[PDB]
Amino acid sequence: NLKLGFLVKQPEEPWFQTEWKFADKAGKDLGFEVIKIAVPDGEKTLNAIDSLAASGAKGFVICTPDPKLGSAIVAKARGYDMKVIAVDDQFVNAKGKPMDTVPLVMMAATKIGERQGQELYKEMQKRGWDVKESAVMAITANELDTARRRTTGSMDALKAAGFPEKQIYQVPTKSNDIPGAFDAANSMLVQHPEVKHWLIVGMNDSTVLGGVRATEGQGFKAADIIGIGINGVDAVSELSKAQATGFYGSLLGSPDVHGYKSSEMLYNWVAKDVEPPKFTEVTDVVLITRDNFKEELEKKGLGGK
Ligand SMILES: C[C@H]1O[C@H](O)[C@H](O)[C@@H](O)[C@H]1O
């Protein structure tokens, strides 16, 4: 009866696919229809809201393709008597200050970034790399808070663990995907012939994967590369390959939680003016590798591997 939207910036990522899946679940439970829309850019975002209004949706969950669209999104929604909840990516104002007023569901970015770093360092030690000939490549998306806090967290952890600060090289990526990250990593690789072993730091699976792909192209074998993604669900195809690669593992979050919970809260809000908490931080994480990925997915009920 009631129709609620679930707008995602990147429909191609398993992460977002899963959030859609679990929105559908909440829909069945509570008795609402979820309208699933891809919003890969600003225009499509604004158009999509119009479209929702036409369909008579009461509200929407959104992961905006651009945090800086926040103001506009709110203005449009307001106009249509729509309630908004942000998932994953927080709205910011013109100045890049967060819009605290919009309820947000997100991962504990910093904490998860830090776990990445810890796990990078641990695996390095396991392999017995000489620090003197090792480096960290940090592929950054500093314009996105959530991404920033992951990669910063990771670098902080590595530094805390005793990885030499001066051997940490950052490079911005133009896009938060494989192609973008590849390009970025490549440009950094050719700058540093002296490095024999790389740690790859990136905010998510795709970013790290791009990094890994570049290293391979520059004649690094798996043993000499450690990349640990974040998302988990996005990494399955990699972890499924016959042969081990530079991509060691991924930190599996809870896209299920993000999808279901964001939806359920909106409904309660729309249906019963039950005001959501402003901020919901999801702290779940588990390292999945070649050995355990299958169990851990099935254990979290994201079956298939
Ligand atoms: C938790 C999410 O954070 C951002 O939205 C990234 O772009 C996603 O791929 C995902 O990792």
Side-chain angles (χ1 to χ4, degrees), residues 9-10 13 15-16 19 63 87-89 107 144 146-147 150 176 203-205 230-231 234 258:
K9 60 183 195 177
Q10 294 174 241
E13 289 200 349
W15 178 267
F16 286 109
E19 284 186 354
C63 186
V87 76
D88 302 315
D89 298 8
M107 63 156 60
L144 176 69
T146 191
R150 269 170 271 184
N176 297 324
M203 66 110 158
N204 68 7
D205 285 329
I230 297 164
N231 275 10
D234 298 3
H258 292 205

Side-chain angles (χ1 to χ4, degrees), residues 200-216:
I200 313 273
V201 169
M203 66 110 158
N204 68 7
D205 285 329
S206 287
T207 302
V208 176
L209 274 173
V212 168
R213 292 289 94 81
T215 68
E216 291 168 354

Side-chain angles (χ1 to χ4, degrees), residues 80-132:
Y80 293 135
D81 288 317
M82 262 168 187
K83 301 283 189 271
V84 182
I85 293 187
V87 76
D88 302 315
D89 298 8
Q90 179 169 30
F91 293 2
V92 299
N93 70 10
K95 300 153 269 212
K97 273 45 117 79
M99 301 180 39
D100 286 334
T101 49
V102 187
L104 170 77
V105 172
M106 76 174 291
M107 63 156 60
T110 292
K111 283 336 216 195
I112 290 179
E114 282 168 4
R115 178 64 182 278
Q116 186 192 59
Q118 308 171 346
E119 294 294 345
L120 273 183
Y121 196 73
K122 188 208 249 72
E123 181 56 15
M124 187 189 63
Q125 277 194 136
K126 190 140 331 352
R127 273 141 122 151
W129 289 356
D130 180 10
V131 73
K132 308 195 205 98

Side-chain angles (χ1 to χ4, degrees), residues 95-281:
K95 300 153 269 212
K97 273 45 117 79
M99 301 180 39
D100 286 334
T101 49
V102 187
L104 170 77
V105 172
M106 76 174 291
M107 63 156 60
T110 292
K111 283 336 216 195
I112 290 179
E114 282 168 4
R115 178 64 182 278
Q116 186 192 59
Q118 308 171 346
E119 294 294 345
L120 273 183
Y121 196 73
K122 188 208 249 72
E123 181 56 15
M124 187 189 63
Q125 277 194 136
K126 190 140 331 352
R127 273 141 122 151
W129 289 356
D130 180 10
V131 73
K132 308 195 205 98
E133 41 193 32
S134 306
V136 172
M137 183 197 301
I139 316 176
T140 70
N142 275 341
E143 318 78 7
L144 176 69
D145 187 74
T146 191
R148 218 212 305 112
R149 286 146 69 213
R150 269 170 271 184
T151 54
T152 289
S154 185
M155 281 182 305
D156 280 358
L158 277 160
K159 287 184 251 214
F163 198 93
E165 223 179 332
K166 62 134 164 20
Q167 272 154 246
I168 299 177
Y169 313 110
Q170 311 182 31
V171 59
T173 183
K174 283 165 203 59
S175 64
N176 297 324
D177 51 22
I178 299 193
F182 179 90
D183 284 340
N186 218 51
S187 76
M188 178 65 45
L189 286 171
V190 293
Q191 281 178 39
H192 289 283
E194 70 279 2
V195 177
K196 320 264 169 317
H197 331 281
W198 288 101
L199 306 180
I200 313 273
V201 169
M203 66 110 158
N204 68 7
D205 285 329
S206 287
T207 302
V208 176
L209 274 173
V212 168
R213 292 289 94 81
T215 68
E216 291 168 354
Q218 292 296 330
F220 291 79
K221 74 193 187 224
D224 287 316
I225 306 295
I226 311 167
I228 299 178
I230 297 164
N231 275 10
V233 291
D234 298 3
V236 171
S237 68
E238 188 69 12
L239 289 182
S240 286
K241 288 178 167 169
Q243 315 177 221
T245 71
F247 188 96
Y248 175 61
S250 176
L251 296 174
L252 169 68
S254 286
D256 57 324
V257 173
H258 292 205
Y260 192 106
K261 192 138 172 66
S262 63
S263 283
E264 153 190 30
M265 281 189 313
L266 177 69
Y267 171 76
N268 283 347
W269 193 14
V270 153
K272 319 159 180 146
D273 183 53
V274 169
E275 261 298 69
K278 291 290 180 192
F279 185 65
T280 301
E281 205 172 53

